């Protein structure tokens, strides 16, 4: 536990673990910081997201290596048993992130940026669960991902400009959900295309810095559009 450690020391040690590429320790340090019960700053939200993205990222890429070896079909139980073990660790991490969001971070208080950030992340970790789920459990999980993304979209439409990097990232992840998870490629193409076009229109207001940040993400939308169309 991190209960005996100063919030400020937890944040410093999260930064040291990022520098050392110790992302499991970075995630434990950021979880301790969240359980102090104060709001995260923009910088702290990004540390929390980078730590858990790296941890689950490694697990999703392992799960897919093992799930491929498993699916090659023309046989001992070992591949299935190791795929199940990695799957259970991945589900463990997602439930930890989803418990932090529901218990500590998702509130009606705070700016649109924090409110959207946390509901997108909810939609994303439900999406990571949906990738490995089956049957009735998968259906529930897909519905939980959709409601979190939709609520994040409603706020971003009202309280952010169409070039906002958080709003673009959310719209990208939601199109990825439509395409990869909910078998809805039309809805995916429509959302990515609308999001691209609506953002194209506001680019002239942006300094060099925020121009780069918007266009980096707008390209990922166009690259998915190229692949889907």
């Amino acid at each position: 536990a991190m209960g005996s450690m100063e919030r400020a020391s937890l944040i410093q040690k999260a930064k040291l673990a990022e520098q050392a590429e110790r992302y499991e320790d970075m995630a434990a340090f950021m979880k301790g910081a969240v359980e102090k019960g104060e709001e995260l700053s923009c910088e702290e939200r990004n540390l929390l997201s980078v730590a858990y993205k790296n941890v689950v990222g490694g697990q999703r890429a392992a799960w897919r290596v093992l799930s491929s070896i498993e699916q090659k079909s023309n046989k001992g139980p070992e591949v299935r048993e190791y795929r199940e073990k990695v799957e259970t660790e991945l589900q463990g991490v997602c439930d930890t992130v989803l418990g932090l969001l529901d218990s500590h971070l998702i509130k009606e208080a705070g700016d649109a940026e924090s409110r959207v950030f946390y509901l997108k992340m909810k939609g994303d970790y439900y999406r990571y669960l949906a990738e490995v789920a089956t049957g009735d459990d998968k259906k529930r999980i897909i519905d939980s991902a959709r409601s979190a993304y939709q609520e994040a979209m409603d706020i971003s439409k009202k309280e952010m400009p169409p070039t906002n990097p958080i709003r673009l990232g959310l719209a990208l992840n939601f199109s990825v959900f439509h395409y990869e998870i909910a078998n809805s490629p039309e809805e995916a193409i429509s959302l990515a295309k609308t999001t691209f076009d609506e953002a194209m229109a506001d680019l002239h207001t942006l300094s060099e810095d925020s121009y780069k940040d918007s266009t980096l993400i707008m390209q990922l939308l166009r690259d998915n559009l190229t692949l889907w169309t």
Binding site: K53, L172, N173, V176, T226, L227
Partner: peptide, 9 residues
């Protein structure tokens, strides 16, 4: 090219 999602910068 496969489907890609938001990076963390």
């Amino acid at each position: 090219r496969r489907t890609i999602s938001a990076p963390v910068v």
